[PDB]
Design a protein around this ligand. Structure first.
Ligand SMILES: O=C1C[C@]2(CCOc3ccc(Cl)cc32)C(=O)N1c1cncc2ccccc12
Ligand SMILES: O=C1C[C@]2(CCOc3ccc(Cl)cc32)C(=O)N1c1cncc2ccccc12
Ligand SMILES: [Cl-]
Lengths: 305, 302
């Protein structure tokens, strides 16, 4: 029993974090095999960041301009190239702690663990989800650039996020490990804002199933609904539309608890129109949307890595 | 910006988790140097958990009865002893991944990271606090016994908890790394219940200071209070009494925000009275009590 926002063990990722310094800028890098991946804004100065030309800035730089540090050992840069918004620094030494890995691009609603680092040294680990507006509600300070997001499936680490910047509202923006941003953002100091966010409907449903599995049933009712009627209700409360794919994905949870997905949708509809009335679900007064159906099954079963 | 329930990087602890098997029981162990520490209930069978005699059960065991596994390698047990409710198995090999460590006993209200393991293999990591009733609101299933709680302050790992059992209410009970339980609990299957829990007042105050540091002030008011008047109001909402030590501890946060601890206490008094009225503090509709003053300074300042 118990339900917590659980992160994947960070150990395999800790052995990859390095500190990257170019000029006056210092951020984090990911050292996999003989390459260090880091945000390309490590080459930017104060004047440069206003309107940067990264090809023009990079072409001036030589290998010795980049100081890469792995603990107390200095790694010597022997080459460099740019891939979208990420800088790939070829180093003379392959990381002996390189795990089995893949670079994956995740979709909004999907979750991942974040290893927050400062000066190539990891400080903490937390769990979070890619919001529908493509931002992440993370916990980051200046110097956290280059911190990575990941999932660990069996023994393989799937890198899905590299932190780049914070938006004026306190939320965070970054790219996949191939340099492509999540969201309509750019790596430049400019007026940018996160779009209006929405609630991840499929995840709230998964979390309602997790509450039922842990002995919380007060919110259940005898009623059911159609997917069409539920979506008209959810649209009014700024919830993401629920698709047939979401219904199929919630299948195993529906069978484990004996509550149909449309039956659970009718419970969610009552919570939206009437609230909790002084009650909580899994120790929360708000409807939690940062646990996917897969996270619920992995936590209420005990899967190891 | 941003405020999350953040755990310490688990890597140093992952390199210590082993699987311990005695008879039919299988749980987790902590391998530090040439010793494996695990809950002593690994020697108990079916008609043993009600009224076990651990000295009589252990005296019947030899070294070769304990199978210790570190990944795919089997560790050889060369000795054994019991320390309170923990079993210490001497092994022939010192752990090459043994970090710099200390065994610390924490007090109620204090927080720590938990590395949840099954069959000596870590599955997840989360943050949690020792509740005033000495239990932890954790996430554990059968096979999680021997999972450990820790803090990593600087480069040293401070082991403070080892998981032993789940109480009928869904909460968890365990010991420090010297086998002394936290709470009036026993490693028996007898009828045991967690005492009535209370809210960690000092932690809610620390979390209110964290909200002010992140730009939120709606809950502040023009009033102040005395410590005694605040405690009379707090006791009605099942809050732990706030002591002079708690006031001193909140000192740096009071100076950083410019808000006196007794003025922040008046905000909490009002919050308890009014609720939130459709508003949230740091993305929460409830008053969070699982972040200490130290956790707030760590996450907001460095
Ligand atoms: O360290 C940096 C570099 C910076 C600074 C602003 O100008 C830019 C412009 C573009 C880019 Cl890609 C990055 C940055 C940025 O957002 N961060 C941070 C990143 N995450 C959280 C943060 C919190 C507080 C201050 C900074 C933070
Ligand atoms: O694996 C064990 C052994 C056990 C089983 C019950 O009898 C006892 C009696 C004493 C002791 Cl020290 C441990 C146990 C126990 O609580 N757990 C668990 C531990 N954490 C969570 C759990 C959830 C669901 C089932 C079991 C759980
Ligand atoms: Cl303590």
């Amino acid at each position: 029993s118990g339900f917590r926002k659980m992160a994947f063990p960070s150990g395999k990722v800790e052995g990859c974090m390095v500190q990257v310094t170019c000029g006056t800028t210092t951020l984090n890098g990911l050292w996999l095999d003989d390459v260090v991946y880091c945000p390309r804004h490590v080459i930017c100065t104060s004047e440069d960041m206003l309107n940067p030309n990264y090809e023009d800035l990079l072409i001036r730089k030589s290998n010795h301009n980049f100081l890469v540090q792995a603990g107390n050992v200095q790694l010597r840069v022997i080459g460099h190239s740019m891939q979208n918004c990420v800088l790939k620094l070829k180093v003379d030494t392959a990381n002996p702690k390189t795990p089995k890995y893949k670079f994956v691009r995740i979709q909004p609603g999907q979750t991942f663990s974040v290893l927050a680092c400062y000066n190539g040294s990891p400080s903490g680990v937390y769990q979070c989800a890619m919001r529908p507006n493509f931002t992440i509600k993370g916990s980051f300070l200046n110097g956290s650039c280059g911190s990575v997001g990941f999932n660990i499936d069996y023994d393989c680490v799937s890198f899905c996020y590299m932190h780049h910047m914070e938006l004026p509202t306190g939320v965070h923006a970054g790219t996949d490990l191939e340099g492509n941003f999540y969201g309509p953002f750019v790596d430049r100091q400019t007026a940018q804002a996160a779009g209006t966010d929405t609630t991840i409907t499929v995840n709230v449903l998964a979390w309602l199933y997790a509450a039922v599995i842990n002995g919380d049933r007060w919110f259940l009712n005898r009623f059911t609904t159609t997917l069409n009627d539920f979506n008209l209700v959810a649209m009014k409360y700024n919830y993401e539309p629920l698709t047939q794919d979401h219904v199929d994905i919630l299948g195993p949870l529906s069978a484990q608890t004996g509550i149909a997905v449309l039956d659970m949708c009718a419970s969610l509809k009552e919570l939206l129109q009437n609230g909790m009335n002084g009650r909580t679900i899994l120790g929360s007064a708000l409807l939690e949307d940062e646990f996917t159906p897969f996270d619920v099954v992995r936590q209420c079963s005990g899967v190891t890595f």
